[PDB]
Amino acid sequence: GMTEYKLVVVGAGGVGKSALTIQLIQNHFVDEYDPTIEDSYRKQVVIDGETCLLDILDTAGQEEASAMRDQYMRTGEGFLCVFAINNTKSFEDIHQYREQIKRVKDSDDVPMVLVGNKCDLAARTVESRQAQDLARSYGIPYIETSAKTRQGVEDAFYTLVREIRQH
Amino acid sequence: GMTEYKLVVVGAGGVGKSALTIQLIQNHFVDEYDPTIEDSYRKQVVIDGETCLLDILDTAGQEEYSAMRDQYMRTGEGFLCVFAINNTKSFEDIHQYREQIKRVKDSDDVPMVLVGNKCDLAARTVESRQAQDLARSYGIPYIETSAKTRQGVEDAFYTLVREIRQH
Amino acid sequence: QMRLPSADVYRFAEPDSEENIIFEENMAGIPIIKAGTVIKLIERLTYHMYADPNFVRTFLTTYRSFCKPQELLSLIIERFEIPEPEPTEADRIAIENGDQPLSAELKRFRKEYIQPVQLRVLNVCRHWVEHHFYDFERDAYLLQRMEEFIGTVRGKAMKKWVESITKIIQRKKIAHNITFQSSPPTVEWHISRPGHIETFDLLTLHPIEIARQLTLLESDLYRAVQPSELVGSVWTKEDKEINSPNLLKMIRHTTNLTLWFEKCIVETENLEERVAVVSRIIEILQVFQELNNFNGVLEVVSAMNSSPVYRLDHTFEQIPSRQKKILEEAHELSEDHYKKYLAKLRSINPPCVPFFGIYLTNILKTEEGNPEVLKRHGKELINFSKRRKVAEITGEIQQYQNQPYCLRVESDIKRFFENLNPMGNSMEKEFTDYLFNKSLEIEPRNPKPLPRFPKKYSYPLKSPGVRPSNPR
Numbered sequence: 141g142m143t144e145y146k147l148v149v150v151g152a153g154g155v156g157k158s159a160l161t162i163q164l165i166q167n168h169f170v171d172e173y174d175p176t177i178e179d180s181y182r183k184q185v186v187i188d189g190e191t192c193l194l195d196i197l198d199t200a201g202q203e204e205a206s207a208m209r210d211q212y213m214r215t216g217e218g219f220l221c222v223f224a225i226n227n228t229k230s231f232e233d234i235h236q237y238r239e240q241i242k243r244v245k246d247s248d249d250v251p252m253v254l255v256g257n258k259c260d261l262a263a264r265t266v267e268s269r270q271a272q273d274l275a276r277s278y279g280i281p282y283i284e285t286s287a288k289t290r291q292g293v294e295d296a297f298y299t300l301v302r303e304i305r306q307h
Numbered sequence: 308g309m310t311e312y313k314l315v316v317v318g319a320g321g322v323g324k325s326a327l328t329i330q331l332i333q334n335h336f337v338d339e340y341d342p343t344i345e346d347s348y349r350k351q352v353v354i355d356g357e358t359c360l361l362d363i364l365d366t367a368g369q370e371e372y373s374a375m376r377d378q379y380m381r382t383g384e385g386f387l388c389v390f391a392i393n394n395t396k397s398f399e400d401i402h403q404y405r406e407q408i409k410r411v412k413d414s415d416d417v418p419m420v421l422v423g424n425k426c427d428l429a430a431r432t433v434e435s436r437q438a439q440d441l442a443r444s445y446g447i448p449y450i451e452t453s454a455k456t457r458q459g460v461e462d463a464f465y466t467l468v469r470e471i472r473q474h
Numbered sequence: 475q476m477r478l479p480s481a482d483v484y485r486f487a488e489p490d491s492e493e494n495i496i497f498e499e500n501m502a503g504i505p506i507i508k509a510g511t512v513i514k515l516i517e518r519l520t521y522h523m524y525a526d527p528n529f530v531r532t533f534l535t536t537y538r539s540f541c542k543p544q545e546l547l548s549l550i551i552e553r554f555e556i557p558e559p560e561p562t563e564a565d566r567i568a569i570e571n572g573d574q575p576l577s578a579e580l581k582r583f584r585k586e587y588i589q590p591v592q593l594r595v596l597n598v599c600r601h602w603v604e605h606h607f608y609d610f611e612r613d614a615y616l617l618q619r620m621e622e623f624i625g626t627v628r629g630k631a632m633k634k635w636v637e638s639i640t641k642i643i644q645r646k647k648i649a650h651n652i653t654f655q656s657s658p659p660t661v662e663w664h665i666s667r668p669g670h671i672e673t674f675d676l677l678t679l680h681p682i683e684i685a686r687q688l689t690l691l692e693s694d695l696y697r698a699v700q701p702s703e704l705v706g707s708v709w710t711k712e713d714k715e716i717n718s719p720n721l722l723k724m725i726r727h728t729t730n731l732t733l734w735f736e737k738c739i740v741e742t743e744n745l746e747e748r749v750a751v752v753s754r755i756i757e758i759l760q761v762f763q764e765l766n767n768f769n770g771v772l773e774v775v776s777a778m779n780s781s782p783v784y785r786l787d788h789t790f791e792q793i794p795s796r797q798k799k800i801l802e803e804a805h806e807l808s809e810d811h812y813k814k815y816l817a818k819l820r821s822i823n824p825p826c827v828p829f830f831g832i833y834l835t836n837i838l839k840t841e842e843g844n845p846e847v848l849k850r851h852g853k854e855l856i857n858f859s860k861r862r863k864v865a866e867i868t869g870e871i872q873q874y875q876n877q878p879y880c881l882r883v884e885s886d887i888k889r890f891f892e893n894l895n896p897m898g899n900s901m902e903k904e905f906t907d908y909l910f911n912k913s914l915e916i917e918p919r920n921p922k923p924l925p926r927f928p929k930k931y932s933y934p935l936k937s938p939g940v941r942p943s944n945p946r
């Protein structure tokens with residue numbers, strides 16, 4: 141009945157979780173900043189010759205919704221952890237997301253990818269190396285992406301699927 | 308090992324048509340019907356003490372796809388030509404369906420049954436006499452059903468199988 | 475646990491019972507609701523414990539069968555005004571000692587009940603406005619009420635979302651780029667050269683470009699169909715032209731193109747030319763298959779299966795062996811109630827253009843073969859499993875609607891196909907009769923011998939094939 145994968149996209153407010161997701165789904169770049177509460181998307185796609193159904197939970201970065209987090213990290217099979225490369229604070233918050241996920245699912249081996257978004261912007265303030273170092277300490281791949289430009293977008297989501305498959 | 312019959316339901320849309328096949332296949336002494344489910348158009352039955360399998364093609368809802376009609380009709384051995392007793396147009400449509408079936412099967416007698424269906428509590432506008440006379444002139448059975456109350460549903464399909472057997 | 479308000483000040487605090495909510499047996503693992511009262515349904519639509527954004531879609535898509543839009547708005551506004559609890563004993567004691575209360579319980583209920591429930595009410599509001607805006611166009615008092623509601627929401631907690639929804643409502647009142655990594659292939663030309671729209675025809679346009687432009691055209695038509703044209707089986711009712719104009723525009727395009735394929739075939743009276751014509755059409759079928767244009771595939775298959783075309787045995791005796799094989803594979807998609815098609819669809823890599831007919835039949839039978847309500851203990855529960863089933867169908871549809879085709883529009887070929895009118899001024903019966911007669915004329919029934927007819931095409935009949943070229 142085709143394999144289904146529950147992906148969750150988490151990260152600080154404004155980093156571009158929704159922009160990344162809607163780019164993947166619709167090949168469209170959302171230019172407005174509308175704060176998400178809880179959105180859901182489905183996508184049938186062939187990865188590595190196998191057809192699968194992606195279930196993408198797009199979540200709220202705004203701190204006002206921090207209580208509703210546990211609620212989705214339970215279901216989720218794999219996580220996109222997104223920060224923006226021009227937002228040092230969004231990078232620092234990542235550690236908290238990773239730690240909460242590990243906690244809730246009670247495992248060290250939880251499929252996730254570290255996404256550094258907005259890499260089309262030249263005003264970079266988080267260094268690739270800094271993020272790459274964090275990725276390895278987590279034992280997870282680091283992918284830089286631009287939801288505006290499409291760079292890395294498929295690479296990030298589909299890499300996550302590959303991780304969930306091997307898990 | 309046993310005979311499989313291909314039954315095709317045709318007739319004007321937007322009236323009662325779908326109720327017929329549903330009423331046969333199911334037996335809502337268990338709730339929840341799902342046409343999504345494979346072989347929810349397959350039904351094993353004993354007619355005149357000879358067991359057989361009924362395959363019902365009812366494309367209710369696709370009436371506007373009028374050029375797909377020859378294709379659907381072509382697949383079947385016997386035909387249920389359905390109109391609604393409170394919709395004169397659907398009755399007047401009957402002649403054209405019949406003419407069309409004769410054409411794709413390439414025969415002057417194709418096993419068919421005329422079915423007059425009572426889909427709601429509105430005033431009847433096709434009296435059973437006109438329907439019978441029309442059925443007589445075509446040389447085919449006439450069955451009146453109220454699929455809402457299970458009345459006459461089996462009589463319509465079983466009669467049609469009798470026709471296929473006595474061709 | 476955690477205490478709720480009184481069921482006498484807040485209707486959505488009524489305890490779950492088999493007289494107000496029934497669960498499906500199986501299980502994430504969140505409960506799946508089988509039936510419930512409207513009150514209970516709306517409570518679960520905005521439950522505090524867990525997320526279910528799929529439930530938001532199901533509900534907003536199908537609610538009008540059991541609850542009016544104004545009633546819905548009233549009940550969510552009601553749901554949103556949750557009364558705060560009175561200070562506890564610990565709290566009372568501190569206030570009479572001149573201290574600040576710890577307000578532990580109040581702070582918890584705010585963070586673990588009020589905040590999630592209000593956020594999810596606003597979520598229903600966002601989605602209702604973003605994706606089901608038609609309720610508001612057809613009832614402006616409803617839009618006023620929503621605008622007022624959003625605009626009276628105070629509290630810094632909800633500040634960011636209130637501003638957002640206000641902006642979205644405003645965009646929708648007064649009214650879509652695509653980005654590909656890759657660049658689209660080059661538009662392909664045959665005998666008819668660019669600009670020369672007078673010469674465009676089945677044989678003179680490149681068959682590759684015919685499939686592509688029809689696929690862009692048909693994809694666009696598929697993507698425009700809203701779930702409002704689907705719920706309630708409204709496309710089969712008296713006012714179908716009012717409620718389902720996009721669905722009908724699309725079914726109508728399909729029927730025209732099928733009848734055009736038929737006409738092209740039976741109006742080519744010379745056998746050899748007709749063979750070229752049938753052949754080219756099967757070539758177009760092949761490019762359709764490549765593009766995952768399943769609507770287009772069926773257009774061709776229906777044409778071939780039609781009464782005046784199916785009987786042309788002399789024409790199909792002369793089709794290349796490879797092409798018999800293609801028409802057979804394609805026809806077989808539809809056998810056993812579209813078994814192989816459904817398998818293929820659920821297995822390809824989109825973009826694709828599904829065949830909309832399967833969906834219409836399933837929605838209709840679903841609406842017709844399940845009860846509106848379930849009676850338990852004298853009570854009437856809304857039968858929600860019926861509604862979830864319809865939503866899974868509208869969901870499938872919406873899902874295939876996202877991915878766009880990476881192909882260049884050629885405006886003149888696009889216009890040519892948008893204006894295609896095989897039936898002219900003729901009614902469907904008289905045109906259908908004509909086609910069948912022409913079929914009898916060109917290949918009479920046994921045992922009448924097969925006549926000869928003069929050629930009609932001045933240009934070359936050789937197909938340029940279905941393999942794309944590539945200069946630069």
Ligand SMILES: Cc1ccc2[nH]cc(CN3CCC(NC(=O)[C@@H](N)Cc4c[nH]c5ccccc45)CC3)c2c1
Nearest residue numbers: 778779783784785787790791793798799801802805
């Ligand atoms: C699969 C399919 C669908 C629509 C169609 N419309 C017309 C045809 C061709 N046709 C040929 C004669 C008769 N079939 C036959 O005689 C078959 N045993 C041989 C055959 C199967 N598919 C064909 C395709 C082209 C030519 C011959 C064949 C009936 C069907 C056709 C075939």
Ligand SMILES: Nc1nc2c(ncn2[C@@H]2O[C@H](COP(=O)(O)OP(=O)(O)NP(=O)(O)O)[C@@H](O)[C@H]2O)c(=O)[nH]1
Nearest residue numbers: 153154155156157158159171175176201258286287
């Ligand atoms: N240049 C550029 N802008 C981007 C990129 N991704 C997002 N943005 C912009 O940044 C803003 C935030 O996007 P959004 O996806 O809404 O962020 P979010 O993380 O979903 N926010 P929230 O958590 O509140 O829902 C928007 O104005 C969007 O256009 C990117 O890769 N490049």
Ligand SMILES: [Mg+2]
Nearest residue numbers: 157158175176
């Ligand atoms: Mg967002």
